[PDB]
Amino acid sequence: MIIDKLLQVSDGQAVTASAASTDVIDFGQANPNTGMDDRSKMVITVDESADAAGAATVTFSVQDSADNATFADVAATGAIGKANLAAGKQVVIPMPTKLRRYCRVYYTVATGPLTAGKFSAQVVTGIQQNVAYPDSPRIA
Amino acid sequence: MIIDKLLQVSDGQAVTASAASTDVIDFGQANPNTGMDDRSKMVITVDESADAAGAATVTFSVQDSADNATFADVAATGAIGKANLAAGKQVVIPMPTKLRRYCRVYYTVATGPLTAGKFSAQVVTGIQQNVAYPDSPRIA
Amino acid sequence: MIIDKLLQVSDGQAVTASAASTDVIDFGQANPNTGMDDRSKMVITVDESADAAGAATVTFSVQDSADNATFADVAATGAIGKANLAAGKQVVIPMPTKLRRYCRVYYTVATGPLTAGKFSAQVVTGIQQNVAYPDSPRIA
Amino acid sequence: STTNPTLADVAARMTPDGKIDPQIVEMLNETNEILDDMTVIEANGFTEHKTTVRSGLPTGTWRKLNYGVQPEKSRTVQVKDSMGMLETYAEVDKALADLNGNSAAWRLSEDRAFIEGMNQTQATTLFYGDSSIDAEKFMGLTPRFNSLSAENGQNIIDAGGTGSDNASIWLTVWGPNTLHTIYPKGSQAGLQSRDLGEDTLIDAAGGRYQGYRTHYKWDIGLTLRDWRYVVRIANVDVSELTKNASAGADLIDLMTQAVELIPNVGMGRPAFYMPRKIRSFLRRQITNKVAASTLTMEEIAGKKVVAFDGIPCRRTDALLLTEARVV
Amino acid sequence: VRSGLPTGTWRKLNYGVQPEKSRTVQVKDSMGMLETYAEVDKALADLNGNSAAWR
């Protein structure tokens, strides 16, 4: 999986409270709409695990702003549970089609606070997803 | 005397107690074994002088380890006396033939503690060693 | 391993108490400084073994003198333990870089005294040393 | 504390009374060969390789008389999978390389070790490619077949071992539509050693340095179009192997049943990849089964395995011998 | 004799990865001389004419 280091935000951020990503992506325009390249997508990988007091959930969500100051959600995942965040779980959020300057990634954490677990968010084209599909399944 | 920025260890350490060197050389292998090189050799320079309560000696000695933690001497000089350590006296230790990862230089100081004297250790190829030799000595 | 019959000292000496070498090398000059050949090196080879009541160590050390009267260390090894002195172990001392007339070999035996063990000390140019090196080491 | 590493004054370490040692004995190079055997085709998507694969058949129906039945729809999912780039620079302070003029001789002796280091890494990663942990690497042969529950789980053959001292053998078919590597638009595969020439460096302080540098791109991905064409023979406890196909796990049946697992070896070309340790016990086990049969006096050594079943059986070192047993 | 290969890295776009170094140690091995003289009194080799036959 190729990654652009510049489109990388949250390099390996330790998500404990419901906090935002470290870096905020700045496009060189008011309406990048790079959701429109029909190719870009946010990926959040997980390490090491959704360790928590539990039961907790982590909602990954992309946010836009006009300026780097006040954000609002443009895509969201849903309450992905702890123990669905084993080391190695690509949560893909497709890039929203109407992007504005300054995209960020927020982590909506359901109580209690996550105690250990990093996540790395990046815009790629595109993910490595080739899971095996059944064949017979009578044989087998 | 040409020098490797990295093979410099203990830059001008004001060795007062019988202490080990500041920096520990980490070779990148289980067995650098650079004595077989027949070229590398440790040099410890002295400045300004091994002034102390006296009469004191500093036994310079190299140490190996498997890991950067527990050392054992692999070569040594002997009790080099004070006033044999004026500013400008290289005590050269040829490099032990059977080195390990992580080499360092220990300054074994016999009592009393040194009051002044830095020592500069580095691995070079090779030492600048030109002692003057007699002439006749009849004439004159 | 080529040997000069004249630099040969301690042919197969039973070093039991902490003693000196039998024979003393007399170079024909005040300061041979034979470390500068960067080629000459002391070797103490072992036979048959360091049997002692144990656990004992043998710190081999080269000594110079101005005249053949009092010796002083100019090189040393460190406490080579018993059970590292099986029949067949070259313990190499690189030639001290600053030699005087009359070099000898001292065997500083840490207590208790050795019950059996011969040693061969001689200056050679240079040693036969071919240590086994890794393979992969993943396979196998 | 511990100081290092670009290229410390151990050019000394590579020379004689003289120049850089040409005849250097290349120790840690191993002769694994998927890299030679592997097929390379440009990947089709932007930096991934899409592949449409049939997911559901229309079934048809037995139809009772006078009754107009449902139309069917053949459902079909597609999968895309990515590449990764593996590349490195190789710098030396120009002052260190220049002495005794072994500037070129050095660049060279260092280079041989770089080629070998890349093959070493590429093949070690083609088998243990975790794109789920390392993110940056393309995903290889494990854990595409890992848990026995996975849809290609039938294709991994449990050798029946247990504990950590156990390998796996691979059986694949390299060909356009069953398994291949993929390289980008428009970077070519594989390993490109471009020599950057002399250029300035930076001392960590800022304090100027100056040196040579060499690049080594080699960017591959890996289509596994369908897991039906790849079968893994897992938990081969290697300590328990015996030449008498006796205690522990036999290779020859565990190997042919892997051959029967492939739906027709038609295209492109099959290959077994076994750890060298396995290849040896394989040679011995074969001659031992044939020994109770018909082997001549002179063919007592046993021809080294070449074609197991008319499938080249390739030795690959960059393949772990102490692998965790696959639950 | 080669002691270590450079390991390389996978690099994400726009991000320079560290240079590698190929470590390599050397091992030397010695000789020994094996020789003898073989003297014969010249008179003994010459007699009954076997100088070269004896030699």
From TrEMBL, chains A, B, C:
A Pfam family that the UniProt record links to this protein: Bbp16
Superkingdom per UniProt: Viruses
Record's protein name: Bbp16
Species for this entry: Bordetella phage BPP-1
Gene (name only): bbp16
UniProtKB/TrEMBL annotation, chain D:
UniProt xrefs under Pfam families: GP7
InterPro entries: GP7-like
Stored NCBIfam families: MCP_gp7_epsi_15
Protein name, entry field: Bbp17
Gene designation per UniProt: bbp17
From TrEMBL, chain E:
Origin: domain of life: Viruses
Protein name (record): Bbp17
Organism: Bordetella phage BPP-1
Phylogenetic lineage: Viruses, Duplodnaviria, Heunggongvirae, Uroviricota, Caudoviricetes
